[PDB]
Amino acid sequence: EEIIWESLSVDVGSQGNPGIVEYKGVDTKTGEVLFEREPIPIGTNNMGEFLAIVHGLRYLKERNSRKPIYSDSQTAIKWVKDKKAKSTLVRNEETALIWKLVDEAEEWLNTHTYETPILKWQTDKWGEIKADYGR
RNA sequence: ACAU
DNA sequence: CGATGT
Ligand SMILES: [K+]
Ligand SMILES: [K+]
Ligand SMILES: [Mg+2]
Ligand SMILES: [Mg+2]
Domain boundaries, chain A: 1-135
A11 annotated as belonging to a binding site for a ligand? yes
Q: Distance between CA atoms of A65 and A86, rounded to whole angstroms?
A: 28
Instruction: For residue A134, give the ligand nearest its CA.
Output: 1
Measured CA to CA in angstroms, residue A77 lies from A10, A27, A58, A101, A118 at distances of: 11, 19, 15, 17, 7
Distance in Å, CA A73 to ligand 3 centroid: 6
- The residues that bridge with A71 in the sheet, in sequence order, are A120
User: Any idea what DSSP says for residue A126?
Assistant: H
Query: A45 CA to B4 C1', in Å?
Result: 8
Query: Which of A29, A40, A37 has its CA nearest to residue A11?
Result: A37
Q: Distance between CA atoms of A81 and A66, rounded to whole angstroms?
A: 17
CATH fold for the domain made of A1-135? Nucleotidyltransferase; domain 5 (3.30.420)
Structure determined by: X-ray
Query: Which of A130, A8, A108, A6 has its CA nearest to residue A51?
Result: A108
Residue with smallest Cα–C1' gap to C6: A75
- Let me know: does A8 contact A27? Beta carbons within 8 Å: yes
